[PDB]
Amino acid sequence: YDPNEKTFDKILVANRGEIACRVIRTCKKMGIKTVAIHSDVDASSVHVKMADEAVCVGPAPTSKSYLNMDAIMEAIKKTRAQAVHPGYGFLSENKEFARCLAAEDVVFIGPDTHAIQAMGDKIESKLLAKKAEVNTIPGFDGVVKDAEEAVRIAREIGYPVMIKASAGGGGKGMRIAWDDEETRDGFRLSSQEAASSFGDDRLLIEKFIDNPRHIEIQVLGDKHGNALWLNERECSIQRRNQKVVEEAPSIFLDAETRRAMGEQAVALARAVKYSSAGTVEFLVDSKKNFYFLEMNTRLQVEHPVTECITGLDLVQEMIRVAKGYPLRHKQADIRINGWAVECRVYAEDPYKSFGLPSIGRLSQYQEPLHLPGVRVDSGIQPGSDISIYYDPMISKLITYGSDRTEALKRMADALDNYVIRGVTHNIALLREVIINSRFVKGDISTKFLSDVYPDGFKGHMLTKSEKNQLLAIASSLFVAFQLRAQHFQENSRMPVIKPDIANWELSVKLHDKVHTVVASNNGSVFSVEVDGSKLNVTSTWNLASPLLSVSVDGTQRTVQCLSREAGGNMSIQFLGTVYKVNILTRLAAELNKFMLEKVTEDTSSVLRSPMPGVVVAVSVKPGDAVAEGQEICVIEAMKDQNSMTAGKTGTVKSVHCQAGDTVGEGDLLVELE
Amino acid sequence: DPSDRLVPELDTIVPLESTKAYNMVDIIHSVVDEREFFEIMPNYAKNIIVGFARMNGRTVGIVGNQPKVASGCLDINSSVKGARFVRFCDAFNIPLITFVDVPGFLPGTAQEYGGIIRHGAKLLYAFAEATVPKVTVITRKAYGGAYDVMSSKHLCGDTNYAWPTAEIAVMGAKGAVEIIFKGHENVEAAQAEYIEKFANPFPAAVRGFVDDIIQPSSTRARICCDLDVLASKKVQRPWRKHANIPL
Amino acid sequence: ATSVNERIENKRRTALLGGGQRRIDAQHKRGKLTARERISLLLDPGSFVESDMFVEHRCADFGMAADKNKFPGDSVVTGRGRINGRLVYVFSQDFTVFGGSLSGAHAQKICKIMDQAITVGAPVIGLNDSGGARIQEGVESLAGYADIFLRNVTASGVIPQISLIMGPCAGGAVYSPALTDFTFMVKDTSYLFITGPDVVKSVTNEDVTQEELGGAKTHTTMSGVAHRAFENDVDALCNLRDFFNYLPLSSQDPAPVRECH
Numbered sequence A: 001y002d003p004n005e006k007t008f009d010k011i012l013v014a015n016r017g018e019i020a021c022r023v024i025r026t027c028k029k030m031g032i033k034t035v036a037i038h039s040d041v042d043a044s045s046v047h048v049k050m051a052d053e054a055v056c057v058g059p060a061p062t063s064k065s066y067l068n069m070d071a072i073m074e075a076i077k078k079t080r081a082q083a084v085h086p087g088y089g090f091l092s093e094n095k096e097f098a099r100c101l102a103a104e105d106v107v108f109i110g111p112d113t114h115a116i117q118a119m120g121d122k123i124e125s126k127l128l129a130k131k132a133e134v135n136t137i138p139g140f141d142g143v144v145k146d147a148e149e150a151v152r153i154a155r156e157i158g159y160p161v162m163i164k165a166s167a168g169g170g171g172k173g174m175r176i177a178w179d180d181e182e183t184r185d186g187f188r189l190s191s192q193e194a195a196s197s198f199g200d201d202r203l204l205i206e207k208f209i210d211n212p213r214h215i216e217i218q219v220l221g222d223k224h225g226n227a228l229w230l231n232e233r234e235c236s237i238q239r240r241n242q243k244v245v246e247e248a249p250s251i252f253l254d255a256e257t258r259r260a261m262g263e264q265a266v267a268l269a270r271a272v273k274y275s276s277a278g279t280v281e282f283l284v285d286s287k288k289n290f291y292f293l294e295m296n297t298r299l300q301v302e303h304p305v306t307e308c309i310t311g312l313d314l315v316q317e318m319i320r321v322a323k324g325y326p327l328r329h330k331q332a333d334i335r336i337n338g339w340a341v342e343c344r345v346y347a348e349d350p351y352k353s354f355g356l357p358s359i360g361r362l363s364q365y366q367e368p369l370h371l372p373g374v375r376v377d378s379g380i381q382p383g384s385d386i387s388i389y390y391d392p393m394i395s396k397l398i399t400y401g402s403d404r405t406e407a408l409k410r411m412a413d414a415l416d417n418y419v420i421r422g423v424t425h426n427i428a429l430l431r432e433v434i435i436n437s438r439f440v441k442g443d444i445s446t447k448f449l450s451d452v453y454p455d456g457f458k459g460h461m462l463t464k465s466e467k468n469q470l471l472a473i474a475s476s477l478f479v480a481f482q483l484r485a486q487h488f489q490e491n492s493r494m495p496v497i498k499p500d501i502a503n504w505e506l507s508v509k510l511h512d513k514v515h516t517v518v519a520s521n522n523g524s525v526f527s528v529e530v531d532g533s534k535l536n537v538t539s540t541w542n543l544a545s546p547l548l549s550v551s552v553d554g555t556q557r558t559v560q561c562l563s564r565e566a567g568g569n570m571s572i573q574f575l576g577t578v579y580k581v582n583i584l585t586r587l588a589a590e591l592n593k594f595m596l597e598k599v600t601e602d603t604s605s606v607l608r609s610p611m612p613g614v615v616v617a618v619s620v621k622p623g624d625a626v627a628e629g630q631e632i633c634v635i636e637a638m639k640d641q642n643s644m645t646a647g648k649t650g651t652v653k654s655v656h657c658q659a660g661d662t663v664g665e666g667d668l669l670v671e672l673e
Numbered sequence B: 001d002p003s004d005r006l007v008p009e010l011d012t013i014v015p016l017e018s019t020k021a022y023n024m025v026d027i028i029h030s031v032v033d034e035r036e037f038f039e040i041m042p043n044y045a046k047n048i049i050v051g052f053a054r055m056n057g058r059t060v061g062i063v064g065n066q067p068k069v070a071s072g073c074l075d076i077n078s079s080v081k082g083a084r085f086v087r088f089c090d091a092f093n094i095p096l097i098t099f100v101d102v103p104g105f106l107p108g109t110a111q112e113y114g115g116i117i118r119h120g121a122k123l124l125y126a127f128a129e130a131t132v133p134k135v136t137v138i139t140r141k142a143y144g145g146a147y148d149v150m151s152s153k154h155l156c157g158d159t160n161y162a163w164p165t166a167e168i169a170v171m172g173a174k175g176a177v178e179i180i181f182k183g184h185e186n187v188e189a190a191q192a193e194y195i196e197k198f199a200n201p202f203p204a205a206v207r208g209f210v211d212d213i214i215q216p217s218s219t220r221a222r223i224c225c226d227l228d229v230l231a232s233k234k235v236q237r238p239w240r241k242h243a244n245i246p247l
Numbered sequence C: 001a002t003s004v005n006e007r008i009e010n011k012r013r014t015a016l017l018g019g020g021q022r023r024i025d026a027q028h029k030r031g032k033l034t035a036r037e038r039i040s041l042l043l044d045p046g047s048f049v050e051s052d053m054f055v056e057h058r059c060a061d062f063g064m065a066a067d068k069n070k071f072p073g074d075s076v077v078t079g080r081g082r083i084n085g086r087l088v089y090v091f092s093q094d095f096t097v098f099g100g101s102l103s104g105a106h107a108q109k110i111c112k113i114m115d116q117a118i119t120v121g122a123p124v125i126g127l128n129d130s131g132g133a134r135i136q137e138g139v140e141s142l143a144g145y146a147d148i149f150l151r152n153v154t155a156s157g158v159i160p161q162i163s164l165i166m167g168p169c170a171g172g173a174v175y176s177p178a179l180t181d182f183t184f185m186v187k188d189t190s191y192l193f194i195t196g197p198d199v200v201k202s203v204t205n206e207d208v209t210q211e212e213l214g215g216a217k218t219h220t221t222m223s224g225v226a227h228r229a230f231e232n233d234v235d236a237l238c239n240l241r242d243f244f245n246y247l248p249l250s251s252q253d254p255a256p257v258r259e260c261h
């Protein structure tokens, strides 16, 4: 971070989110002015406020704002910025952008056009890697055009077959084939999908590696001809062929294999004359045999992890190399220091296919920056919203330690101390992954999530002791709220006679079971008896802080109280998982035994208004039996006619809606069976 | 719950263009202690929100407009629902906090035949006779007599604040231009000048109608401070057996 | 030699003439009287004492500072008088000046009369004929309404407040009569609505006239807003005097007792 060295005085960051913030932070540490592009919706983002000046480039969609070459070039000309940093994604691997930037005097901080073009298609990448004497996945070199050629190639390469789309990206257009019929129908549908998605329609057939390990080598090159490999990374934990958890050194690897893979990656980089930061990805089998798989000619998303074990700043090195300076490190200087782990906190529901993108506005956002060995890379601030236009990633959380165990412990603590209110996230899944027995042992593959959760993610299956601890914490919190409710100021007209209750006898319903709890308070210490077991819970009992730290029998636990109702319902985030409990007094439970179970007649057999809108006309009458796919009535809503399908069978008892009528959400319109 | 807690989540909650709506319940939850709100009549006359909460441990009554429902316009049901709640809070020494995003009253023959004048007068009266401390925050539009009704400074209001998105005017720009520059028939620049000069809190700020224009992230803190100084508010009014509210 | 005397005389003659002779004739063609004629009919002969006769508005936007836009009195005639020997305070809105729209000076005059009436303990009678808030005034006009509104709520139960709508009334001008004790209307020439028919057609998309939306029949037979409707201005004012004879001057006074045969 020497300011004496002369670099560009103006850099434009042609990206958004956390990567823009990271680049701007590096530039500020390097004393470089920054220009930030943004859309209209991102006018109040973190990166625009962090930068020195901002330029609007278009509307919300990425096709018109961040992929709009003309707007970016107008911004560059207006701001007279000397350098441009594309981050990752968007225009980072676009040859037209690089060429048009090279037309002017503005420099592109990244690989040259030749390197990007070479590693732009997978077939040519594989051919070049084979020419460069790098182990490659066995398969057929060429574009498969008919299903017969595909099934033949499957015959001479073995029935396990990986069908892939050229260029591709985002973990899409890739499928598995075990049979000739599977080969041909997968080939046809993959051609159709590639036409729908990319249009390249060039498909590749290769051998599928069984139980593979995704190991990346981080390479760094300069225009003079020096190439370095900055250790490795492991990114096996994936869903939808996308990483969620990354590890700094691969526990699966030893020194010799690491050196071999680093040398091979350096050889490939020299072959393509790479002159920036990049990564070479490999699929290592159980027998420590690695094969080349793709080369990312851009900054890697999980790059900070290696920054924790090498002590380097990759963005600064990219800037210096783009300026023209030689590398200031040698291969001997690169060394492994400690251990590091990264988790991607996404705004998605982990209970639906290991993640389903969600939308909303963050009403509360607090990061565990004060915890030891914690680094956060986020472009999210309180009040930020998650839209349908951009990636739903919330943050990248990185922890480092002396060994793997310390890093994992700090990772778990950071996940426990992370406040996100407003959207659904995947913190529960990450915490379950990092404390898994197999993950701690180290035996993992790219199918870890698929086989650890064959039926889908279900949450933390809490043991007996953990269940008792959770029940004790919930009961103590309930009693603490009850006690706080009795603290009034002095009235001097009618004094308050505080009740002298000694033991609180409660019935606590968790899942489908009811437990009897006896709680006693002795100041800041609660003695809780759960079904015989005795526990002591102590804390400051601050009922307003989002994070509450308690000590149960000496074990420290951080919990969050997401929701609470006067009826006894509480949502408690404990060990990363949200549990719904219901707490009543014993008398309340005994009297509640007489309450009738409410039956919901609105659920089915009723056209309860799914959403507010105006109905043009009604296509049904009393006495008509609906069928699946038969719309009941066409209703214009969100400026769209929503003729919702029945999706069930039932004779219409009565009709309450008329043609061209405005009806809000929750209003009955058609009664059926 | 510290009384000086900042609420940065409110800095961008109001959309830039007035066509979009937002939820004032989010603002209420952010502002009040522990985000705990006891709503009264939550499923009836949903264009207005009334309820009980606490700030710095003191019970407060909250009244606000709901731009999600009917663009936040006032009508008969909302007027009565807010009026009786305000009367109860005033009768039992409970401070009142108002959030204003009202564009006006709901038009139509149904409202006029139902007696919208009487019920609007009910709400205006309820805010006017209140002698408890009153704190008002204008988040967006405040047009016409509705602005006077929703606890204006001129009804013996105590403290009035405007967010940088507030708009206090007689009505929207188009109507004012079409009624002022009737014969000009050159509204092309007239509307631009009118929106540049009056479509902002400045006309009310320069006259002293709002005490300050505050950042949305400081709202709670400001309110708490006011509630500390207004706790000893005594006022004197002419004697009567009782008044005659337009029931 | 000073021109102050002729200045006073010219200002007085302009104040009596109101907005102008042409607009007075236009008002008379609609079957409506002027504010000063209404006051002369309502009060006992020779008992009217006017106040704030030379008060003028202070608007400076949209060329309202020009001499042709300056009218002494500013679309309201305010004062005190006697009905059958009993004191009363009265204001009459002059539709001749800017359609009777309420400005800062208009509201200031009305507030001054209301303040004096509550100081001495006498009723307030308001003849309403106003187009609403003066748009050129801006927030000023709004403030004025609120001031009046506040005083109404302060005077409720202290002194009787009577309203007589003798012309169209829109916007906030409908809210002050609603806060008073009794509201009277004149048939075929008085209206009361928050929004006009054009806005109703624009938003709700229904076709109604002014009479159907806010006529005296509408507010006396189905709305519950007005209390009685009279044939015309003269009949309305005679009935207003007769009705005023019933009420006490203040809540500090007992109910009136008259000579009984």
Ligand SMILES: CCC(=O)SCCNC(=O)CCNC(=O)[C@H](O)C(C)(C)COP(=O)(O)OP(=O)(O)OC[C@H]1O[C@@H](n2cnc3c(N)ncnc32)[C@H](O)[C@@H]1OP(=O)(O)O
Residues within 6 Å of the ligand: B144, B145, B170, B171, C098, C099, C100, C101, C102, C130, C131, C132, C133, C134, C135, C136, C142, C145, C168, C169, C170, C171, C172, C173, C196
């Ligand atoms: C606080 C709540 C608010 O913001 S109230 C906003 C005002 N609302 C309105 O609807 C506009 C006011 N005018 C009207 O409603 C109608 O014109 C009513 C009152 C029914 C008058 O009917 P009409 O007999 O046809 O009037 P007119 O054609 O003879 O015109 C007479 C002159 O009066 C004027 N006038 C009336 N109101 C205002 C006003 N609020 N501000 C400024 N000027 C007003 C008109 O401009 C009109 O001018 P002109 O002499 O025809 O050139």
Ligand SMILES: Nc1ncnc2c1ncn2[C@@H]1O[C@H](COP(=O)(O)OP(=O)(O)OP(=O)(O)O)[C@@H](O)[C@H]1O
Residues within 6 Å of the ligand: A137, A162, A167, A168, A169, A170, A171, A172, A174, A206, A207, A208, A209, A210, A212, A214, A238, A241, A281, A283, A293, A294, A446
């Ligand atoms: N031949 C193969 N054998 C086994 N697993 C494979 C094979 N090809 C791909 N995979 C799996 O699919 C994942 C995605 O592969 P790859 O990186 O080629 O895809 P992509 O769409 O180009 O991704 P990216 O977002 O990195 O550009 C790999 O990490 C691996 O888990």
Ligand SMILES: [Mg+2]
Residues within 6 Å of the ligand: A281, A294
């Ligand atoms: Mg890849």
